[PDB]
Amino acid sequence: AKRGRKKRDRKHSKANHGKRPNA
Amino acid sequence: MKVNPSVKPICDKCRVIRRHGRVMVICSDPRHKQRQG
Amino acid sequence: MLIPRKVKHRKQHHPEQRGIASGGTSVSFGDYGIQALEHAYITNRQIESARIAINRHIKRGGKVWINIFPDRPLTKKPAETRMGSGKGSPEWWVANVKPGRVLFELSYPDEKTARDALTRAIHKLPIKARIVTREE
Amino acid sequence: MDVLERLDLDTVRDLSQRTDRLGVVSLYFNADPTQNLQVQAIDLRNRYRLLQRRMEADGSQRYRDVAAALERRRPLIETLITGVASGRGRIMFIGLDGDWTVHFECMMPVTNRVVLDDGPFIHPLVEVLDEGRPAGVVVISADDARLLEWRLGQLQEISRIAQPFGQQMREQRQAREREGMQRFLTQVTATATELAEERGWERIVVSGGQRWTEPAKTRFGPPLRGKVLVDRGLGGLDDAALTAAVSARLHRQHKYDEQQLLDYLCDAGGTGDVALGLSEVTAALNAGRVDHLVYDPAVRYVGTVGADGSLYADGEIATKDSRFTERLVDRALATGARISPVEGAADAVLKDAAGVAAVLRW
Amino acid sequence: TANIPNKLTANVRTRTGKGASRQARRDGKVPAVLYGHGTDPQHLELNARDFAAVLRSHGTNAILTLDIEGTEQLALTKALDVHPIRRNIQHADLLVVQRGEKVTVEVTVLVEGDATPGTLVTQDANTIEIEAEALSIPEQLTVSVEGVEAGTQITAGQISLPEGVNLISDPELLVVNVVEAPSAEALEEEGA
Amino acid sequence: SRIGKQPVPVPSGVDVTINGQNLSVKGPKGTLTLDVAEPISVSRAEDGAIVVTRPDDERRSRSLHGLSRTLIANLVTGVTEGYTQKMEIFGVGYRVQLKGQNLEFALGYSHPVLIEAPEGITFAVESPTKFSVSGIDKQKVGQISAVIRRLRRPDPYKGKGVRYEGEQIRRKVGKT
Amino acid sequence: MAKADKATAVADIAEQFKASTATVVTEYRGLTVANLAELRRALGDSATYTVAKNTLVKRAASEAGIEGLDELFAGPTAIAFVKGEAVDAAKAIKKFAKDNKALVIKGGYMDGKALSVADVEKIADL
Amino acid sequence: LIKLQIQAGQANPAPPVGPALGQHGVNIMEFCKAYNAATESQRGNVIPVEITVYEDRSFTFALKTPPAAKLLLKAAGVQKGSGEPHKTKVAKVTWDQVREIAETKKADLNANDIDAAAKIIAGTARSMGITVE
RNA sequence: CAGGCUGAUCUUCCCCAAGAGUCCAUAUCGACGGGAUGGUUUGGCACCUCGAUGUCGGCUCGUCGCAUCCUGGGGCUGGAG
RNA sequence: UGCUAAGUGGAAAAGGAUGUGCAGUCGCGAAGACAACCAGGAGGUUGGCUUAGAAGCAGCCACCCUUGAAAGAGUGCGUAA
Numbered sequence A: 001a002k003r004g005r006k007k008r009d010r011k012h013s014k015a016n017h018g019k020r021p022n023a
Numbered sequence B: 001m002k003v004n005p006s007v008k009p010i011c012d013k014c015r016v017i018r019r020h021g022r023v024m025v026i027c028s029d030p031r032h033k034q035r036q037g
Numbered sequence C: 001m002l003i004p005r006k007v008k009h010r011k012q013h014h015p016e017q018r019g020i021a022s023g024g025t026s027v028s029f030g031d032y033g034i035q036a037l038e039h040a041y042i043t044n045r046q047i048e049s050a051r052i053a054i055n056r057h058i059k060r061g062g063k064v065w066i067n068i069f070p071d072r073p074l075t076k077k078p079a080e081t082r083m084g085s086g087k088g089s090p091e092w093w094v095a096n097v098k099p100g101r102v103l104f105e106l107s108y109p110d111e112k113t114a115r116d117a118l119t120r121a122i123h124k125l126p127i128k129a130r131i132v133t134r135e136e
Numbered sequence D: 001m002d003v004l005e006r007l008d009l010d011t012v013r014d015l016s017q018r019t020d021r022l023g024v025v026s027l028y029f030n031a032d033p034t035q036n037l038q039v040q041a042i043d044l045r046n047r048y049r050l051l052q053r054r055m056e057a058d059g060s061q062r063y064r065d066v067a068a069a070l071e072r073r074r075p076l077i078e079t080l081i082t083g084v085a086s087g088r089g090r091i092m093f094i095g096l097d098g099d100w101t102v103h104f105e106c107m108m109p110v111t112n113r114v115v116l117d118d119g120p121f122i123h124p125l126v127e128v129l130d131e132g133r134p135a136g137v138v139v140i141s142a143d144d145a146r147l148l149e150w151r152l153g154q155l156q157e158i159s160r161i162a163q164p165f166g167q168q169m170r171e172q173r174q175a176r177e178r179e180g181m182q183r184f185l186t187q188v189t190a191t192a193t194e195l196a197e198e199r200g201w202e203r204i205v206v207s208g209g210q211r212w213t214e215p216a217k218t219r220f221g222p223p224l225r226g227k228v229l230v231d232r233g234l235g236g237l238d239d240a241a242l243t244a245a246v247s248a249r250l251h252r253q254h255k256y257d258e259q260q261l262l263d264y265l266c267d268a269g270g271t272g273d274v275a276l277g278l279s280e281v282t283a284a285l286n287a288g289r290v291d292h293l294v295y296d297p298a299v300r301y302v303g304t305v306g307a308d309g310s311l312y313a314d315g316e317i318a319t320k321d322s323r324f325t326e327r328l329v330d331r332a333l334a335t336g337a338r339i340s341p342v343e344g345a346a347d348a349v350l351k352d353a354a355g356v357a358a359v360l361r362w
Numbered sequence E: 001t002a003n004i005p006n007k008l009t010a011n012v013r014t015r016t017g018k019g020a021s022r023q024a025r026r027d028g029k030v031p032a033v034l035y036g037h038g039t040d041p042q043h044l045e046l047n048a049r050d051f052a053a054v055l056r057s058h059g060t061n062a063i064l065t066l067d068i069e070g071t072e073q074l075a076l077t078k079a080l081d082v083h084p085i086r087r088n089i090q091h092a093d094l095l096v097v098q099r100g101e102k103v104t105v106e107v108t109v110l111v112e113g114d115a116t117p118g119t120l121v122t123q124d125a126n127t128i129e130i131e132a133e134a135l136s137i138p139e140q141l142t143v144s145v146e147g148v149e150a151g152t153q154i155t156a157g158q159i160s161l162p163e164g165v166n167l168i169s170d171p172e173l174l175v176v177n178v179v180e181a182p183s184a185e186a187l188e189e190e191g192a
Numbered sequence F: 001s002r003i004g005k006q007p008v009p010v011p012s013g014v015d016v017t018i019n020g021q022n023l024s025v026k027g028p029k030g031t032l033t034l035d036v037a038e039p040i041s042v043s044r045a046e047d048g049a050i051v052v053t054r055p056d057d058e059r060r061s062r063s064l065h066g067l068s069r070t071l072i073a074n075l076v077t078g079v080t081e082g083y084t085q086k087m088e089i090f091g092v093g094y095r096v097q098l099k100g101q102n103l104e105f106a107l108g109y110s111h112p113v114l115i116e117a118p119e120g121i122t123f124a125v126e127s128p129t130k131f132s133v134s135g136i137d138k139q140k141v142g143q144i145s146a147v148i149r150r151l152r153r154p155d156p157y158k159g160k161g162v163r164y165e166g167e168q169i170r171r172k173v174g175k176t
Numbered sequence G: 001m002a003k004a005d006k007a008t009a010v011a012d013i014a015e016q017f018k019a020s021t022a023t024v025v026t027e028y029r030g031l032t033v034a035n036l037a038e039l040r041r042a043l044g045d046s047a048t049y050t051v052a053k054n055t056l057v058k059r060a061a062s063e064a065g066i067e068g069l070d071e072l073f074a075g076p077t078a079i080a081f082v083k084g085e086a087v088d089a090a091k092a093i094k095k096f097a098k099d100n101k102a103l104v105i106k107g108g109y110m111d112g113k114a115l116s117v118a119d120v121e122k123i124a125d126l
Numbered sequence H: 001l002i003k004l005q006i007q008a009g010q011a012n013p014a015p016p017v018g019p020a021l022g023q024h025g026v027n028i029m030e031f032c033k034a035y036n037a038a039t040e041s042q043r044g045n046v047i048p049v050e051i052t053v054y055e056d057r058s059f060t061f062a063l064k065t066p067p068a069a070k071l072l073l074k075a076a077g078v079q080k081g082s083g084e085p086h087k088t089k090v091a092k093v094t095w096d097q098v099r100e101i102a103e104t105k106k107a108d109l110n111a112n113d114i115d116a117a118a119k120i121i122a123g124t125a126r127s128m129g130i131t132v133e
Numbered sequence I: 001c002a003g004g005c006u007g008a009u010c011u012u013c014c015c016c017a018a019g020a021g022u023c024c025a026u027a028u029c030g031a032c033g034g035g036a037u038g039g040u041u042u043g044g045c046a047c048c049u050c051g052a053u054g055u056c057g058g059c060u061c062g063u064c065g066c067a068u069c070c071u072g073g074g075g076c077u078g079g080a081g
Numbered sequence J: 001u002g003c004u005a006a007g008u009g010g011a012a013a014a015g016g017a018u019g020u021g022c023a024g025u026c027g028c029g030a031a032g033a034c035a036a037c038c039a040g041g042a043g044g045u046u047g048g049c050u051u052a053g054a055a056g057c058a059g060c061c062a063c064c065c066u067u068g069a070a071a072g073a074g075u076g077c078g079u080a081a
Helices: A002-009 C044-058 C111-122 D009-016 D037-055 D061-072 D075-081 D123-131 D170-199 D213-219 D239-268 D278-286 D324-334 E018-025 E048-058 F059-080 F138-149 G003-018 G033-043 G054-061 G067-072 G087-100 G117-125 H018-022 H030-039 H095-104 H114-127
Strands: B002-004 B015-019 B022-026 B034-036 C032-036 C040-043 C063-066 C072-076 C089-097 C102-107 C129-133 D024-030 D089-095 D101-106 D113-117 D135-140 D144-151 D154-162 D204-207 D228-230 D274-276 D290-295 D303-305 D319-321 D338-341 D357-360 E006-012 E029-035 E042-047 E063-068 E071-081 E091-096 E102-112 E119-123 E127-133 E141-144 E152-155 E174-180 F015-019 F022-027 F030-035 F041-045 F049-053 F083-090 F095-099 F102-106 F121-127 F130-135 F161-164 G022-027 G047-051 G078-082 G104-110 G113-115 H002-006 H047-051 H091-093 H130-132
Touching: C032 C111, C040 C044, C044 C063, C044 C089, C044 C102, C044 C111, C102 C111, C111 C129, D009 D123, D009 D324, D024 D037, D024 D075, D037 D061, D037 D075, D037 D113, D075 D089, D089 D123, D123 D324, D123 D338, D135 D170, D135 D239, D144 D170, D144 D239, D154 D170, D154 D239, D170 D213, D204 D213, D204 D239, D213 D228, D228 D239, D239 D274, D239 D290, D274 D278, D278 D290, D278 D324, D278 D357, D290 D324, D303 D324, D324 D338, E006 E048, E018 E029, E029 E048, E042 E048, E042 E063, E102 E119, E102 E174, F015 F041, F022 F059, F030 F059, F049 F059, F059 F138, F083 F138, F095 F121, F095 F130, F102 F121, F121 F138, F130 F138, F138 F161, G003 G054, G003 G078, G022 G087, G033 G047, G033 G087, G054 G067, G067 G104, G067 G113, G078 G087, G087 G104, G087 G117, G104 G117, H002 H018, H030 H047, H091 H095, H095 H114, H114 H130
Parallel strands: B002 B034, D135 D204, D204 D228, D290 D338, E006 E063, E029 E091, E102 E141, H091 H130
Antiparallel strands: B015 B022, B022 B034, C032 C102, C032 C129, C040 C089, C063 C102, C072 C089, D024 D089, D024 D113, D089 D101, D135 D144, D144 D154, D274 D357, D290 D357, D303 D319, E006 E042, E029 E042, E063 E071, E071 E091, E102 E127, E119 E174, E152 E174, F015 F022, F022 F030, F041 F049, F083 F130, F083 F161, F095 F102, F121 F130, G022 G078, G022 G104, G047 G078, G104 G113, H002 H047
16 A cells, blocks of 8 residues: 555645645 | 564573664573574 | 443444543552553453453462453444445444553562563553552 | 263273272173174173182182172173163273272273272273274365264264355356355364364364365464374265264374384384383383383283382292283373383384383483 | 641742643643632642652641742642643642641551461552641551451551541541452452 | 773883874884774873873763773783684594694595685694694784684584684584 | 661671680681581680671771771681680681681781781790 | 482382482492491481492491481371461470470581570471471 | 455464473464554455446466575574484 | 754654663662672571472472571572482
């Protein structure tokens, strides 16, 4: 589950402020 | 040599040291020799 | 294994896992105890596995108290079926544990064996815990 | 006035310690219907008659009392001839002065024997127990699974499990059935392992068919996979044929194990780890060094017994008896050794050692 | 028993609430309240490390002497608010007292001595109530289990109290219970 | 700490030269040179002794302080007394003979094995099953002895192979 | 061996010092408890044979005017107090000294003065 | 030095004395004949022997008083002591009896007084559950 | 049917050590309980394709991973050879 | 002004561990503490029971006394004992 984990974990950027669509 | 995530001093003469970034147990009894990995 | 004799409602919502414990955070019966540090459902099988680990270590003398009871049931629907058509039948009984709650207790004449026996039981539980005493 | 069940080494030890003021007579009756039963009955009666006549041809107070006691306990033998259950081999220990009797029956065959002794005569019972160790039987099909136990030549059921995972292209259906069958094997082997740990099984006979017999063998753990016997035709057999097949398989395995033990004893004889010959075996039993005693049950050993109970072989310097094997077995039981009577040890491999050998503890 | 009161410096709080108490604790302080027969509570602040030192050695029912901005006061510790996890002192109730006054106080009882080797000592009641003078509260109470045989109930009425101390709780409290040591078979049937 | 706070006494017939951080010592039986780690300063007291000091009590200054004193102490011992090692051989048919300046070993192989002597050390043989390795440098002597020791794999059953003079190996038993 | 235990032990040695007519000091290293028993039984009539920490004895030596014995408390040390007589005690040591050879005499105190190792030997002879 | 216990009334048994000093190269028959000659004065109390061998295998054996544990069992009439002392006590022994054992152990104990040696024997009685009065 | 998310089930490891192992938890097996990786099995969802993404097995041709069957280098052994 | 030596920064659990920095309690110590070297480490006795054996050291119960500077009814290794 590398693709799913990477896409969810990239919502912890400073520009996203902890949220992205589709998590 | 035992390669386990957990190393412990099985007997009273085992010593825990740190070589090259690993944690190791060295004893005069060759069975008790073991490293972390 | 600990099982209630009867319950009014057999299918229930999941227990909530928010907040810290209000009551049961102090050692009352014995001299040593195990205090939780995380939220979990402690199943009635992990309690039996954890109080036999204490029994084996201390052998003959001493007394053991279990301060939590597996009252609340969790369901499980039949295997390999689509979603829908009812709610599953109960299968295991859990206890809602919050941080600060004291789970087990022990009385034993000497300290080194008492703290070793309680350590053998923290390794059977799905949470972190620490050993506390009656003193302040 | 009681009937024993579940014979084992502890029960044999506790029974051999009994005693009677006059004596105990031990009767082993061979009621196998393959041989003529009336012949065995007459043979047993004749053996009793010779025992009684040898009592009555001495001329002593003790001997006349013993002869009277023997004449009084006559009808118990005709009771034995028509015993309680439907067994092949029957065994009865009768106390002379007292009014106590012990009855036992088993499917393992025996040979007629009437022995008068201070205590019960144990030797053939140990042989029967050696040849009748328990085992488990597991039968698998695509639908169900039977679990049975074999003990002393008799098969009794334990469980009958059904397929819980049994429920479009043919390939997908076959794959689903394969997965269900694998889960079924895992569950059945788990149940069998639990039962083996419970009831002390030594060997397991696993049958699955022409496809599912080897996977079931490999599912068992390393503790048990070394003691699993593979047979493929156990399915569809009735109880009689099933019992016959399991008995034959276990007999073959037991003979193979005995051959391996004899080879080990022959090889290790010479390094001082094991002792060969009656003299060294008796000397080791005196100090209780024997961890494993092996003797040929057919050979009639002659021995001498001292005041302190120590056993002395021929030429060792004192009451001399011809039923010395009973004393050897009693001492081995007393010292906690393991008795393995290998039928035929004194023939080829251990011919120079008369068939008797011991595995020393040090 | 004569106890020399412990001197502690107290400051009157300017702002109360939950935002001001959290900030006070972040600066090594503890909020406190000083009520009693003065009948007008005072909101104080105490040093966190100095307060904990007094409680560590002189017990929980420590007599105090607060310096409330130049005014001396005799106070007694009444209650404490301790975090279950972090094990802090979040608050402290203080009761004003004067010399020659009787107060009701719970003191701890300790079990010293080795009993018969085939017995297990189980202590039921941790503390008992007394009624002593303001400056004469015992720091702890002790009982002796030396040669006590089999099943005996050591009751709260048999605790040896100093002079000027009167038992308040009923004299039928089972304080210490000495019983036969459980065997291995008795362990496996407790909690199954 | 305890190791590196004591001086290194210098006997009479030793010429010690300090050039900044590079330290040289001349003795009756050779010359040796040592380069000291930068935080530690090496200097000679007026009583003819070499002293090492460290400015700070940091983790790295303490570690290199006790280290540096011992190498200096080993540096003056190797030029006045020297270093030697006594070794032995056990087993039947196991022998040593000194060929030229090298060594010949017979250790149950199908071929003799030689040990070329590196410059700085010399070999000496007393008995066919007894020899020694001597030199001027402590680490050079120790390294070559280790190579000789591991010529045969350790034998816990009969103890065949090369050992040290005081070596006390561990043993077991294979009976049959 | 806390502060009081050390203080207790120094009082006993000082108490055991004034009650003795004379005293001799020896070193005992290498003597088995079986060997120590024989020497004590032979001396058990009058003398008492004890050992203690040298530093703690020196403090006990400050209670009595025996300031000339401060150099006898280096190395292992056994002090043998004689309750009565002087000839009997020294001779019993000599027969032991010439047998085990592991016990030698460090010195002795008498008449307010330390007595040399040879001069202690003459008490038994006289 | 092999510490061995042979009862006084037993001559040349197999278990106790047979393999004990046989393996050490010591005489197997010559020990008993000197031992039986000396041990026939008691004839009723088991007395241990300390086989002290010399360079030429000459053994300077020494005879010892019977154990203080045995001397308390027959001083109270019970064959074997208690397996659970402090719970079951087999018998009773008067304080005057205890001094008698300390008298026959006088050459084998540490104590100099008779009261101190009485306490030593009383220690062994405690371990086997014999009350001393 | 394939792809995608999940990972109950499956698979590969691991944490504590009750015990088996003639003695001896850790030569070799490791129970009750706990924590995870992989996306290889059976499933759950129904996100692309129904103005068409042809489905099992074999043949021909391959390319990659190592969680290694042989060959290659070692530590421990209840490894005498 | 400090921290990190891991390219951590620039993925992950139970759990294992003399990595390092800060703050706070407790014990021992110039009456010589910790480490190292020299010497003692005993007697009743092989404590009692159990066991083929059980002698400090499978297991169960107790855990005393003496000479003493101290010496445990014994912290490990080891022998069938």
